[PDB]
Symmetry: D2
Subunit: 224 residues, 4 copies
């Protein structure tokens, strides 16, 4: 059922890249998903998985061929990445991913976006944001560990676009998604790319993914 779900996502949305489902990745996910898991452990594994995730997403950037000479005076033909990038986190869950991104891209600029779902209805509302000034000229790693209804991420993209960010330069880095959130982002922004570690079954009336992980932000920051 998962396999089938996984494949269908894959065949339906060419712009999503699913991390290789290795045993270790599964191990990590079980620890993280487990209710029983203690906070220090949750953080430790969440952190480990995020780095792999980040490494995977970085492969979505553009690169050029570059040739160098080895200390053995022989040429090596490689490549180099030359783009202006930055990470944008959705507060506060996405914030949990900044350290990951900062670990591999020393001093990368970090923008933050705070979105709130309205009380009457629940249309997401932009509450606060601090972004790099030249963001319009950057590739964007948009960080949000969980994509359920996709309401938040779609709002974040709306603002990014409004500011001038090229839709095709947005890379959505995610840990766990629901087919429905996936469908929504692509129906609204077909050009963005999305990298995720997992696709779950459904959402509940409370809009939590299931089997899911619970409230990522509460778990990672320990504000249960």
């Amino acid at each position: 059922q998962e396999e089938s779900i996984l494949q269908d996502i894959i065949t339906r949305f060419p712009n999503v890249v699913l991390m290789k489902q290795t045993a270790q990745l599964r191990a990590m996910m079980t620890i993280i998903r487990d209710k029983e898991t203690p906070k220090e452990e949750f953080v430790f594994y969440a952190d480990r998985l995020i780095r792999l995730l980040i490494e995977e997403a970085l492969n979505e950037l553009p690169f050029q061929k570059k040739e160098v000479t080895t200390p053995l005076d022989v040429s090596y033909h490689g490549v180099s990445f030359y783009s202006k990038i930055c990470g944008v986190s959705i507060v506060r869950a996405g914030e949990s991913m900044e350290s990951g991104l900062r670990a591999v891209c020393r001093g990368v600029r970090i923008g933050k976006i705070l979105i709130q779902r309205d009380e009457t209805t629940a249309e997401p509302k932009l509450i606060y944001e601090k972004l790099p000034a030249d963001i319009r000229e950057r590739w964007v790693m948009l960080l949000d560990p969980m994509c359920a209804t996709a309401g938040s991420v779609c709002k974040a993209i709306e603002v990014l676009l409004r500011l001038g960010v090229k839709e095709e330069r947005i890379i959505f880095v995610n840990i766990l998604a629901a087919p429905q959130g996936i469908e929504r982002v692509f129906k609204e922004y077909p050009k963005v790319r999305m990298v995720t570690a997992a696709v779950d079954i459904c959402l509940n009336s409370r809009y939590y993914i299931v089997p899911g992980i619970g409230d990522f932000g509460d778990r990672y920051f320990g504000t249960m």
Copy 2:
């Protein structure tokens, strides 16, 4: 060219695991192979790449199957790794990899083996070793960035075997290898597993891997 070589090795040596040759992997290999690269950069990147190699390697261990119940109170089908392991570094170069292993495996036991070639005789002699008392009962993550003639690694393996380690329980974790080294390892210990990030074309007159990386141990510790 490289593809040919790779195919052969992949075909003849069913126990080697080449890591996914991603653009990122390549970019990292390009910086660390560059003779112009400054030491700080050299260290940052090697570390980054080592991290990925280690993660790749851990997939070689055996795991069970484990079910957990999520906060949504539904159950999830996962896995867990239950083996006793340890890492063993070949001094000095292998040492560079210890930080990576400790990073993902808090408090993992670390054994050290200093092998040195007689200055006249050219042969490997075990100079110093300090291993965990029950190493005979664990999986050994053998660490050595480079594999040229396979002289050193072969001797390291011989000592491990004399202590009672099971051949099939050694996972040789390597960054760069020459075909001949790979071929030799397998001739002598057909049952070990080898994880590596690159396979070079050949050794040169001084038995240096080419195009190669130079002397890993010197570039990493700065005793150039």
Copy 3:
């Protein structure tokens, strides 16, 4: 002169604790105060200094004598810390210290408070908060690298007190402070403790500490 300001602060407010002015500390502040310093560097040194600062702050917590026995089988008399704690950061500048606290206090719960002065009025207003549920029972490490007019931190303190946190259980961790900001905090909440690494001469019409460091928040997140 600095000495004079330093001493004056020190004799006037028994509750503040100034980090020891070592040359290294000063080398650090030098790097980060220099408008010439590149983001990666700034980040680098800022994190380094934050680690020390945090370690310093951690000594304000209460401890118990504890006796253990060495592997040599003789006793040692130690002094364990047994209190419950948490960090609360003032978004977004304070968030920069979060990683430091987490580095040394594995999985410490982190609360966040987002405040903003009114354009006209200048009354700092609470915009958002997410804190641990039982914060009333904890000791709190309030994090804000810069304390100028102290408006924001006094507002942050107000809400903590409203929430039930005991004033004397609040430890304000700060990098740079203005004498004026210090005086306000103590006029309003004499029972809190403050740990800073440096006291500057004054504040400007735009409310920046001088000679100061500029806007810590953009400098650190790269949104300048």
Copy 4:
């Protein structure tokens, strides 16, 4: 008792630097000495303390005055550390201090020395060394957690001297020491500098520091 001891040493040996005996420091020491502490904790806490230790040691280096202009367009009078340095690990115990050094001094050059006492004779002998080529020009941070009889460090210093390093440029970084140890090092090389976290009572009938911590290298690498 201990207060007497510290006083004597401090008085008789103007070149030793004891870290401030803070409650936190004590707390870390209690966990590390405790024979019941698990290997992960042992490592986490030793790393933390080693980090403070190195930061302390770095103050032993020479520094220049430096003035910079802040973003407020105003001058600040700082200092700069200009010396070329390197870390020198005494294998294997000192290797545990490397990460700490590399954490604060990115890509700093790391030399290694393996000294061993003859199984029969007990004479400490140089078994293996790999040092920077220009070590004579640098300031040396000699690392070794424990200093019992000082036989090892004495030998290490001796070889450094034969290479041309100035006795005055050797900063011996140590976690724990015995009075005898300190005394000998100062009798033989009155000019080195020594930074340490604690000084214990005495040595065992078997030359172990008491109350001590036991065999640090075994406890840290997990080969006990």
